[PDB]
């Protein structure tokens, strides 16, 4: 190509959007923004495919141009805006609040939250650097840059940001025994407690996590997001607490639910 690409084939779209094959040739290409193309959820997909508010792409635009949708407290009229992990979506017309959290299957879930909880979010510290005049700067996973952070905050930590002022309230350090969620890989969407960290100089580090039921797994250090201190999360969790079931016990649960239905 001679420059940036502007389209996205429907079969080449991320598979956690759960698009069907026969609807069209194209998929909504996410706009540039805080989150990556392969790790976001476009506003149109959430607004018509998940919530069933709109039937076509035109109705999504008609909803958005009435300034009804807010993302992290700010009105977004773009229908392909990239919304990502730990983002807050507010609809004041219906008085609804949602937080984008992966379910145990690695897909963004429709997770309703209290309006009190919708005032803050958690962010992962990606970079720490000193700028001009010796002023510290902290860069999070969602492209936020914050000046004068707490001197004890380092990389791979978690900070709580108040969405109205955009300022740090408190933080969680990356230590063994804390609660974390996996944000990528084969264990995406799982929740557990950090057991130990393996350091490989010049390469990727590996972190071992164990869930509430006692199942153990491992990921890379870049795929770990610290949620809470100890066993207590600082956010509300979806229907599944982050425990991944096997296919046999999913079948057993489904059969038990069917038997008790009716």
């Amino acid at each position: 190509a001679r420059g940036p690409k502007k389209h996205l084939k429907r079969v080449a779209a991320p598979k956690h959007w759960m698009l069907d094959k026969l609807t069209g040739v194209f998929a909504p290409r996410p706009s540039t923004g805080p989150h990556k193309l392969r790790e976001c959820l476009p506003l149109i997909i959430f607004l018509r495919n998940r919530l069933k508010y709109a039937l076509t792409g035109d109705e999504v635009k008609k909803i958005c141009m009435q300034r009804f949708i807010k993302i992290d407290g700010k009105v977004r009229t773009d229908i392909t805006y990239p919304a990502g992990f730990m983002d807050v979506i507010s609809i004041d017309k219906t008085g609804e609040n949602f937080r984008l959290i992966y379910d145990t299957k690695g897909r963004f879930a429709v997770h309703r939250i209290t309006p009190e909880e919708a005032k803050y979010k958690l962010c992962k510290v990606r970079k720490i650097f000193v700028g001009t005049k010796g002023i510290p700067h902290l860069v999070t996973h969602d492209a936020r840059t914050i000046r004068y952070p707490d001197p004890l905050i380092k990389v791979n930590d978690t900070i709580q940001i108040d969405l109205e002022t955009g300022k740090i309230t408190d933080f969680i350090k990356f230590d063994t025994g804390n609660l974390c969620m996996v944000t990528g890989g084969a264990n995406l969407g799982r929740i557990g407690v950090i057991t130990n960290r393996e350091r490989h100089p010049g390469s990727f580090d590996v972190v071992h996590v164990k869930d509430a039921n006692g199942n153990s797994f491992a990921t890379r250090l870049s795929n770990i997001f610290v949620i809470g201190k100890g066993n207590k999360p600082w956010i509300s969790l979806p229907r599944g607490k982050g425990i991944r079931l096997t296919i046999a016990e999913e079948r057993d649960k489904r059969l038990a639910a069917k038997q008790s239905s009716g």
Binding site: R147, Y148, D150, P151, L152
Partner: peptide, 30 residues
């Protein structure tokens, strides 16, 4: 905004340095 943020961080940095030096002094004395 610049003045207020600078003053607040100056207070926080003084607090942090004092805490770290006090902990180091306690470690050395023991």
């Amino acid at each position: 905004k610049n003045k207020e943020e600078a003053a607040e961080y100056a207070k926080l940095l003084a607090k942090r340095m004092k805490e770290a030096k006090e902990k180091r002094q306690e470690q050395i004395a023991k």
